[PDB]
């Protein structure tokens, strides 16, 4: 099973504890767990309407030549497609 990584910040503490039921916390707001496509999709679905006014970013194994892809919703660091290659973009203040 692909390893799914979710990072939460400025989210309600309820979701902070809720994600621990599926995937553990290795650092403040960092989660890692092994799931298939369906469980991962449902878990990101749960995170989307539980994070409130917070930032969530998820990384999972994909079928690109880097080997992973990114899903972010209302996050500081967006993801830009450099010709079929996912690279993390950090906007400048």
């Amino acid at each position: 099973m692909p390893m799914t990584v979710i990072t939460l910040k400025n989210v309600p503490q309820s979701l902070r504890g809720d994600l621990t039921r599926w995937m553990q916390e290795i650092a403040t707001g960092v989660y890692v767990g092994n799931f298939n496509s369906r469980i991962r999709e449902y878990l990101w679905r749960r995170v989307q309407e539980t994070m409130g006014a917070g930032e969530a970013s998820m990384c999972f194994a994909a079928r690109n030549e880097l080997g992973y892809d990114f899903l972010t919703e209302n996050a500081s660091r967006s993801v830009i497609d450099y010709d079929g290659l996912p690279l993390i973009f950090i906007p400048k203040e």
Binding site: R16, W22, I39
Partner: protein, 305 residues
């Protein structure tokens, strides 16, 4: 679908019964739900349990668990077994995360019918001992023969590892021991029984609708666990007892090797498939009304006039 809230999860969002971890053992701690998380709070620190990935949670001595923690564990499909000393002390589980009772209906139809129950018991005996043929054995003969061969296996494994065994058989009903072999056997068996109880509660099967064991609410748990107690728990417990040295926690290493054997033997998927085949269920809204002419009738409808 519907609104998503912390602490409550659907069956789809959870892993399959055969795709989860086997068990976790907690002792001298205090399971407690803080911020919608099953948290184990020991003296030093707090440990968060990924209950969605855990099949059964084993509660040892000195373990305190709250009401909301039990509700959360039941919601995640994780079964609760108070695995104290002298074996399993109690069972607990929430609603089954399987909304279809087809497995349970088939199990009931098989156990009520005497010929079907005898056939199912013969199938279990054949699965335990594939080489033999038991097409003519009766129920009492089946029980006596299974006891005799379990005792023979215990004696053989005691001879192999050179450990003193007092011609005894493990039994969840009041089995106590102080020898390291007894402790290892108890640990492996309680882990197996917790896993079996979790699987049965997850599939919707009734733990009381047993075929080989009768007389209590966990007879089917014993029946399912006997299919694997001799092939994993006994040899692994004997190996643990042989390997154990002075000043070593027998339970810790016994459960470690029990999990290793469960992973290597693929006990979880094997148990799911064995329950599939034992009930003679071919591979394939759940609720409906009952009728004689039309069989199932759609529910949630009002029949006027």
């Amino acid at each position: 679908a519907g609104p998503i809230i912390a602490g409550k999860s659907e069956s789809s969002e959870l892993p399959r019964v055969e795709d989860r971890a086997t068990f976790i053992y907690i002792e001298h701690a205090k399971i407690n739900r803080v911020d919608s998380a099953v948290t184990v709070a020991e003296a030093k620190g707090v440990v968060r349990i990924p209950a969605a990935m855990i099949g059964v949670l084993l509660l040892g001595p000195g373990t305190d668990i709250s009401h909301r923690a039990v509700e959360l564990l039941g919601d995640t499909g994780t079964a609760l077994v108070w695995v104290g000393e002298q074996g399993v002390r109690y069972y607990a589980s929430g609603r089954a995360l399987a909304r279809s009772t087809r497995f349970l209906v088939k199990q009931a139809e098989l156990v009520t019918n005497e010929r079907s129950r005898l056939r199912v018991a013969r199938r279990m005996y054949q699965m335990r001992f594939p080489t033999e043929d038991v097409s003519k054995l009766t129920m009492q003969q089946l029980r006596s023969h299974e006891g005799a061969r379990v005792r023979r296996k215990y004696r053989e494994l005691s001879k192999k590892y050179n450990v003193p065994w007092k011609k005894r058989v493990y039994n969840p009903d009041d089995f106590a021991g102080g020898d390291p072999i007894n402790q290892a056997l108890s640990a492996a068996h309680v882990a197996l029984y917790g896993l079996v109880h979790s699987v049965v509660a997850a599939l919707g099967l009734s733990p009381g609708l047993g075929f080989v064991h009768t007389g209590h609410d966990r007879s089917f748990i014993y029946d399912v666990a006997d299919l694997y107690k001799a092939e994993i728990t006994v040899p692994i417990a004997f190996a643990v007892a042989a390997e154990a040295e002075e000043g070593q926690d027998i339970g810790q290493l016994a459960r470690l090797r029990t999990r290793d054997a469960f992973v290597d033997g693929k006990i979880l998927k094997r148990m799911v498939k064995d329950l599939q085949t034992l009930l003679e269920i071919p591979e394939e809204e759940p609720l409906s009304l009952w009728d004689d002419k039309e069989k199932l009738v759609p529910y949630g409808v009002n029949y006027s006039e």
